[PDB]
Subunit: 241 residues, 2 copies
């Protein structure tokens, strides 16, 4: 694990505590209001794996503290008109996704929802790789490959083959709901790690600031307190790469 | 304004709804628990403007939704031993600051708190500027300048010269509390804007993903659904500058 044991356990608990929503009722509106209080929500690709060829049977969204499964098959367009569309189309919250290409296609052509304002962790991995290796790799990384690489999770964490027929059977099984929740549970976290890893020069510049006065002897420190309109002398080399 | 009118009004409300804490009591523990639920908290530089030369009379911390003013002059080290130290020295939450140089100095030498894990918006404006202009500027930007530049706020938003004598008199005046709260109110939002503006290639790569399949005709779209281990054909061009 590259995440803490504490944080891992907290996410595992979140994975078990999902809320399933299959009517536009008070729990729906409470979910929509919680999603709208966040800077970032995560959206799973589960349910959109055929792009524009098929409607989504469900839509999995989370905050950093709570996972929601919306039963799109049963609520139909009502779930979108009652708040999900504005969430997905709006600037805020930003949507975290891992490879939103098919999600975007499915939402637009099957649900009339134009996804906008996304943090894509697959794109982030490509940016981190380019920053390090100068050129892009020839292939992209799966969500599970990223969860292993960035968080240290075991290789089998994501259930990648949900069965298309069971996903459309109702009542929706507990086994499928539990898989959907586990498959989204680490995505919020992944995004925070990838965002930091994208910004290595920035973070070196921060570390220069945090130390610049604090580590100096008194006379030096007092001289620097009078020169705060200036960049620290070691800053340019710090952020260099 | 470069922020929405709605968001502006939300932040001005937060600025008025601060909580003042001057004893290690139930409100204090409530605040520490709230701050520890967050990915990011902000920390104002107000109170630390002489670095190591003087103790902080107050410490102002905020979440995205709530401002807290802690009376360090009255609580003294109890406030740090009761939860503030671990917050400020821990990896999580990350602390947003604008120019943490003196804050870091004061916290360590006057309060035995080693600030760690910071997102510094002054550093972030430097990174943005270097990205755009190739080289670093010859001066740094104040918090007020960055608020105007990035959020569109008016020039006099920050009260940059708190009255030293009223800052150490108790009861702490409403005028000083109100200033302290106004001076931190916009810092969380500033950090979110600066974080996005640091990452322009990333965001163009994201827009490439959102459009790649969605904008294609059906034939192309379906071919692309069979080639998701590959990078979109225009992605390099998108992320190039
Ligand atoms: Gd988080
Ligand atoms: Gd309370
Ligand atoms: Gd925010």
């Amino acid at each position: 694990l590259k995440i803490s044991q504490t944080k891992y356990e907290e996410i595992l608990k979140i994975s078990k505590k999902y809320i399933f929503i299959n009517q536009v009722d008070k729990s729906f509106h409470e979910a929509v209001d919680d999603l709208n209080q966040q800077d970032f929500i995560a959206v799973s690709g589960d349910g959109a794996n055929m792009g524009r060829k098929c409607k989504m049977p469900f839509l999995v969204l989370s905050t950093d503290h709570q996972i929601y499964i919306f039963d799109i098959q049963v609520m139909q367009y009502h779930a979108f008109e009652s708040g999900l569309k504005k969430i997905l189309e709006g600037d805020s919250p930003r949507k975290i996704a891992h490879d939103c290409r098919k999600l975007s296609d499915c939402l637009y052509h099957k649900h009339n929802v134009k996804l906008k304002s996304v943090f894509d962790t697959q794109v982030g991995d490509l940016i981190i790789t380019k920053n390090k290796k100068v050129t892009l790799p020839n292939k992209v990384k799966s969500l599970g490959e990223c969860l292993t690489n960035y968080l240290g999770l075991q290789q089998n964490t994501i259930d990648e083959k949900l069965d298309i027929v069971q996903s459309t059977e109702r009542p929706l099984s507990v086994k499928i709901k539990d898989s959907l929740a586990r498959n989204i549970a680490f995505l919020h976290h992944l995004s925070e790690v990838i965002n930091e890893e994208m910004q290595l020069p920035f973070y070196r510049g921060v570390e220069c600031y945090i130390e610049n006065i604090r580590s100096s002897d008194d006379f030096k420190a007092w001289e620097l307190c009078g020169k705060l309109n200036q960049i620290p002398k070691e800053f340019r080399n710090a952020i260099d790469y």
